[PDB]
């Protein structure tokens, strides 16, 4: 199966204990306190404070 990303979004994000922004990733889901991103083959849950959601 394939998780189609939400169109017109890109996301940069940080993992725990690492200040360097990773990305660009696709946005798969927007929740109240977190987002789901897809970075190549990795689908990850990122707290909103660690996500840079860029309208594209
Ligand atoms: Ni899946």
Question: Would you give an account of this structure?
Answer:
The structure is a monomer. Helices cover 0% and strands 55% of the residues. A 5-stranded antiparallel sheet has the order 4-3-2-1-5, with no helix packed on it. It has strands at residues 9-13, 22-30, 34-39, 42-47, 51-55. It contains no helices and 5 strands. It has a single domain (9-55), classed as SH3 type barrels, CATH 2.30.30. It is mostly beta strands and 56 residues long. The relative contact order is 0.33. The protein starts with 8 loop residues before the first strand and ends with a strand. Nickel (II) ion binds at residues 1, 3. It comes from Human immunodeficiency virus type 1 (HIV-1). It is found in: Host cell membrane; Host cytoplasm; Host nucleus; Virion.
Keywords for this structure?
mainly beta; 55% strand; SH3 type barrels; monomeric; integrase; globular; 56 residues; HIV; binds nickel (II) ion; PNL4.3; viral protein; 0% helix; monomer
Overall shape: it is globular
Please describe the biggest sheet, giving its number of strands, its sense, and whether it closes into a barrel: 5 strands, antiparallel
Number of DSSP E strands: 5
Distance between the termini: 25 Å
Order of the strands making up the biggest sheet: 4-3-2-1-5
Label the structural class: mainly beta
Instruction: Please write the CATH class name.
Output: Mainly Beta
Rounded to an integer in angstroms, the radius of gyration calculated over CA atoms is: 10 Å
The figure for the number of domains is 1
The CATH architecture is Roll
- List the ions, cofactors and other small molecules found in this model: nickel (II) ion
Strand portion? over 45%
Subcellular location: Host cell membrane; Host cytoplasm; Host nucleus; Virion
Domain Integrase-type: 9-56
Protein name: Gag-Pol polyprotein
DNA-binding region: 9-56
